[PDB]
């Protein structure tokens, strides 16, 4: 605008490209929706199967065969908020596991 650009709030982009692969066949372990914005990755899963606050563990990966980073995660209803954007994510429900990947654009 005038001289500079006064940009209100953060630029938001809920990044909707992610894929899942899993060796489990339980539909209640596979995420139904994933999206990040900036850092916080929102993972909608069937967390309603997990009572007593016994929610599953989620890890982040820098690469698909990298180490599983425990990271910071908050659980809002059925959505896991992973604090920090990583190209790959790993979700572990008990001893079952699902892998997510965030796909870059070109």
């Amino acid at each position: 605008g005038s001289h500079m650009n006064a940009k209100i709030l953060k630029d938001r982009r809920y990044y909707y490209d992610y894929d899942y692969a899993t060796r489990t066949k339980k539909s209640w372990l596979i995420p139904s929706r994933v999206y990040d914005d900036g850092k916080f990755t929102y993972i909608n899963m069937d967390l309603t199967r997990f009572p007593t606050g016994n929610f599953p563990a989620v890890f982040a990966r820098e690469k698909e065969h990298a180490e599983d980073f425990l990271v910071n995660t908050t659980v809002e209803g059925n959505t896991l908020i992973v604090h920090g954007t990583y190209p790959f994510l790993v979700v572990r429900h008990g001893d079952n596991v699902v892998g997510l990947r965030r796909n870059k654009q070109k």
Binding site: Y14, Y16, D17, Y18, D19, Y20, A21, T22, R23, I30, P31, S32, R33, V34, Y35, E64, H65, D68, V90, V97, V98, G99, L100, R101
Partner: peptide, 23 residues
């Protein structure tokens, strides 16, 4: 320790198109 590939088998997109691209 995970002495086996965690994920694989079927890489399928799960991109947010839950009903609409967002709404």
């Amino acid at each position: 320790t995970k002495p086996a590939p965690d994920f694989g088998g079927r890489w399928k997109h799960v991109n947010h198109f839950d009903e609409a691209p967002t709404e």
